[PDB]
Swiss-Prot record:
The chain holds residues 44 to 257 of 257 of the full protein. It is found in: Periplasm. Substrate binds at K158, N167. This is Metallo-beta-lactamase type 2. Monomer. It catalyses: a beta-lactam + H2O = a substituted beta-amino acid. Confers resistance to the different beta-lactams antibiotics (penicillin, cephalosporin and carbapenem) via the hydrolysis of the beta-lactam ring. Active on cephalosporin and penicillin.
Length: 214
């Protein structure tokens, strides 16, 4: 199952793609929001091929168009499919910083429309985007669904099983703890936390990430 979707509730699913790296499958997660006005994804996938497959899958499943994607940072698991999005008229939301870094990391440019705290609404689906500070990357954001207390952590947030922070060349490891604390402060009662990779959990993922960073 290279692309899978898993349900959190009626209109919120996790999408998960196995990228192929050195003969290893590597999952990446994002979210699929089924809204009265189309499907909204949080994050694309590793590359255009997978992004196209993801879009195909979700569109067929829900019989709805993907209209918007929120890009959580300017790396491949997240923004790999930006060309696919642009060539489909799928709006690719991001902070200005993510757009700037995208333009630098060799990618087409997302919208740069998100601020530190931004509210979006897609049909009846409310979405908050939050830049908690630097961590995994300078630009990493998280996404929250206030109606459902579901948090999409991206690569800022590690799964329970993770013992390793990943590539930290471009990480702000010291600042990452504070950014996670900012997320823990902001989001008090959380029903689900989606890590960038790995199993969905709850607030314990945030605490576990903090623990890794200690
Ligand atoms: Zn990354
Ligand atoms: Zn990642």
């Amino acid at each position: 199952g290279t692309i899978s979707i898993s349900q959190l509730n009626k209109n919120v699913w996790v999408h998960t793609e196995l990228g192929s790296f050195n003969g290893e499958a590597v999952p990446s997660n994002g979210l699929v929001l089924n809204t009265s006005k189309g499907l909204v994804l949080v994050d694309s996938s590793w590359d255009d091929k997978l992004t196209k497959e993801l879009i195909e899958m979700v569109e067929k499943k829900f019989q709805k168009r993907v209209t918007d994607v929120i890009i959580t940072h300017a790396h491949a698991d997240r923004i790999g499919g930006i060309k696919t999005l642009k060539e489909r008229g799928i709006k690719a939301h991001s902070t200005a910083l993510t757009a700037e870094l995208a333009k630098k990391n060799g990618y087409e440019e997302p919208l740069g429309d998100l601020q530190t705290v931004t509210n979006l609404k897609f049909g009846n689906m409310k979405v908050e985007t939050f830049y908690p500070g630097k961590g995994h990357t300078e630009d990493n954001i998280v996404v929250w669904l206030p109606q459902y207390n579901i948090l999409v952590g991206g690569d800022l947030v590690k799964s329970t099983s993770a013992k390793d922070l990943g590539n930290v060349a471009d990480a702000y490891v010291n600042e990452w703890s504070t950014s996670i604390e900012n997320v823990l402060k902001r989001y008090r009662n959380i029903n689900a936390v989606v890590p960038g990779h790995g199993e969905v959990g709850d607030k314990g993922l945030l605490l576990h990430t903090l623990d890794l960073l200690k």
